[PDB]
Write a protein that binds this ligand. Structure first.
Ligand SMILES: *[C@@H]1O[C@H](CO)[C@@H](O[C@@H]2O[C@H](CO)[C@@H](O[C@@H]3O[C@H](CO[C@H]4O[C@H](CO)[C@@H](O)[C@H](O[C@H]5O[C@H](CO)[C@@H](O)[C@H](O)[C@@H]5O)[C@@H]4O)[C@@H](O)[C@H](O[C@H]4O[C@H](CO)[C@@H](O)[C@H](O)[C@@H]4O)[C@@H]3O)[C@H](O)[C@H]2NC(C)=O)[C@H](O)[C@H]1NC(C)=O
Ligand SMILES: *[C@@H]1O[C@H](CO)[C@@H](O[C@@H]2O[C@H](CO)[C@@H](O[C@@H]3O[C@H](CO[C@H]4O[C@H](CO)[C@@H](O)[C@H](O[C@H]5O[C@H](CO)[C@@H](O)[C@H](O)[C@@H]5O)[C@@H]4O)[C@@H](O)[C@H](O[C@H]4O[C@H](CO)[C@@H](O)[C@H](O)[C@@H]4O)[C@@H]3O)[C@H](O)[C@H]2NC(C)=O)[C@H](O)[C@H]1NC(C)=O
Lengths: 359, 359
């Protein structure tokens, strides 16, 4: 089923939730990838220490092969991350920017009741040069209390990173531009008798004189207006991410002016297409992943093919784990105390290496 | 002179420029620090290759000392960056969020001319139960063309990262909240004759009947209103970053409700106080910086004090540069071609290390 999340956007608040949720999804993809690289670099420092601490030549070559393998794949994956990272961050910033815009518009569009000021009565005056009575109001205002978006359990279940994988997203839903640009209001004028510049009794926030001025045009002559409501209705719009053929982004820029929804759909499409490749996690490497890794052929040939690799790293995963993986979190190093991996990510990392390479 | 940049904020557009400029300043501080770390890690990979390519034991120890020194300071500086990074990013996100808000409010507050709709005439009706004539308008709107902020040369010279060092910043200036929450308008009603529900000639966007209805209340009886302008005036406000004593952030959260300006001032204060420590640039290391570096005492003692260091790295900077710095960009490595530093940041980094450690 496609477009579960976008198909749940029906209001300004759910567009805000979609936009923020998708931005956080892209941000989290980058953070996860960068965490995988940092873990790999921490593994490389750990093996560097173990390589300096081993006396056996072939075991030293074994660690060196893990160092070389790790450097190759992690440097490559870090370089490869840069394009997708920038593409995804471009979309996340724009989505956050849109959600801010919409939240600000929502607060203003909630200002739906006017407070009248005290008017001033006149005769003919611009823009009613032909009137015999005018009632002029300055500084009518409308303000709402602080608005907040409330989400139900299902809003948060449907508009969710779990439904934002690229394979299920074909469109975005946005609030129409009028909500962000247009003030709307209703107003009504009322007249009774012969209102003039002498209609200067203002106690009812209108212009009255004659008889007994009072509530509900109590007086003989009365003129007034009210702004009886404000607020522009939100509408929704759909925008496709892809061309009709399905591969290419719709709404590429540079082809003429675009609306906000079109610019957002383009950025979302590109961010969806910019898949991240995460390299192997070195800290949980298995024997089979190592010897079947394509980079290990030339590395093992340089240092020692798959028969040679097993000869270096173990015939089973159990002994590979014991010799090359478990020491990272379990082997203690003390000199003048910490486990290998934490030590080589600590303030004493360099000093532990110098101490053991010199000893 | 303090507060050059904030003292130049006098309008919504210059607050937007300040907020975006400061966010980019914090972002650039993080990027610069991370670039310095990446350069250092690239130096460490380069020395790792040279250490594998050297035949002399003491020259191998020399490279190892540079590796150990680089790992220590760069891992430490990377760990130390994390708190300040998050503090600065918190402020940059909030400043961008505010600038978005303000730009959206600016577009709405620019909608200063109303378009009247065709009214409907009535007699007495809510909210004028006492009127004999009413003229009711639904869906009056106000919309502006697309707004943009224009900056002068001096706006960009004063509101500039060059004036945003922590030592010169004591306050921020923000637009008052009413600009973001309140619609303001002027309106006027006009009456002539005896307008009633029969005043149903609407050609002038008012209610007329009798005689010859026409422009300027041409008819005998007329009722109408106009919204003659809209728009809320921007005002500015100052908020101090520090308490009266000058050390501590003012506007710490958790002490009661806060306004937007207070939350922003707190984040800006904390981001200003969260100074980043950048480590030595390994790729341009001098001899004197190396031997005077505090970490090199224990490292050199472990591998080889300052007399020992000169013995290992050179008596002059010229020979230190030749032996340990210049080979990074100048020494070519070829096997089955690239300079050392680029090779060890390339897809063949790991393989170059394996090849030379095995040879
Ligand atoms: C969040 O909400 C904010 C607030 O509304 C949005 O911010 C607005 O974003 C739009 C789109 O990015 C901005 O419009 C752009 O404005 C720039 C600059 O325009 C000014 O400077 C130009 C020279 O630098 C000048 O040519 C312009 O003057 C022309 O245009 C005006 C208006 O049409 C016209 O009156 C003039 O006579 C000129 O003809 C102007 O002075 C402009 O460069 C951009 O142009 C590109 O895009 C449009 C639309 O695709 C296209 O027509 C062009 O051909 C060109 O390709 C564009 O107009 C706007 O200024 C922002 N408003 C504010 C207050 O900041 C923001 O987009 C929202 N974000 C999200 C993610 O939702
Ligand atoms: C950009 O512009 C946007 C749009 O205006 C700004 O977004 C607004 O930000 C403010 C401040 O962060 C948001 O207000 C917060 O709202 C949350 C959630 O409130 C709702 O949920 C609560 C439970 O989760 C509930 O208690 C709330 O109900 C109470 O409050 C309302 C309103 O006062 C009242 O009517 C109720 O009866 C209850 O008494 C509500 O349903 C809330 O948790 C926050 O409270 C903290 O902060 C306030 C002020 O410091 C303080 O009073 C509290 O004691 C508490 O410490 C806060 O109210 C607001 O919802 C956002 N609006 C929208 C549309 O998103 C944004 O801040 C701008 N950014 C920048 C950087 O300029």
């Amino acid at each position: 089923a496609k477009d579960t999340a976008a198909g749940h956007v029906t209001t300004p608040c759910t567009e805000i939730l979609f936009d923020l949720t998708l931005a956080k999804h892209y941000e989290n993809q980058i953070q996860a990838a960068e965490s995988a690289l940092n873990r790999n670099y921490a593994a490389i420092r750990s093996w560097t220490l173990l390589e300096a601490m081993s006396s056996d030549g072939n075991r030293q070559n074994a660690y060196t092969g893990l160092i070389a393998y790790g450097i190759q794949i992690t440097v490559n994956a870090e370089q490869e991350l840069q394009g997708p990272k920038q593409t995804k961050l471009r979309a996340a910033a724009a989505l956050r920017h849109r959600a801010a815009n919409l939240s600000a518009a929502l607060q203003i569009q909630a200002a739906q009741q006017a407070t009248l000021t005290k008017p001033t009565a006149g005769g003919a005056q611009t823009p009613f040069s032909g009137a015999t009575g005018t009632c002029k109001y300055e500084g009518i205002t409308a303000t709402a209390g602080e608005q907040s978006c409330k989400y139900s359990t299902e809003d948060e279940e449907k508009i969710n990173a779990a439904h934002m994988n690229p394979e299920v997203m074909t469109q975005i839903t946005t609030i129409g531009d009028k909500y962000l640009t247009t003030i709307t209001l209703d107003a009504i004028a009322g007249s009774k008798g012969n209102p003039t510049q002498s209609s200067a009794t203002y106690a009812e926030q209108d212009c009255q004189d004659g008889g007994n001025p009072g509530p509900n045009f109590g007086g003989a002559n009365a003129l007034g207006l009210q702004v009886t409501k404000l607020g522009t209705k939100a509408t929704t719009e759909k925008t496709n991410l892809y061309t009709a053929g399905g591969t290419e982004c719709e709404h590429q820029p540079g082809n003429g002016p675009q609306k906000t929804k079109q610019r957002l759909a383009y950025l979302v499409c590109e961010a969806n297409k910019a898949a991240i490749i995460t390299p192997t996690d070195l800290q949980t490497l298995t024997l089979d992943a190592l010897i079947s890794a394509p980079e290990m052929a030339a590395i093992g040939d340089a240092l020692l093919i798959q028969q040679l690799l097993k000869k270096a790293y173990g015939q089973t995963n159990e002994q590979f784990q014991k010799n090359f993986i478990k020491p990272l979190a379990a082997q203690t190093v003390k000199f003048k105390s910490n486990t290998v991996a934490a030590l080589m990510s600590s303030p004493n990392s360099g000093l532990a290496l110098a101490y053991h390479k010199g000893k």
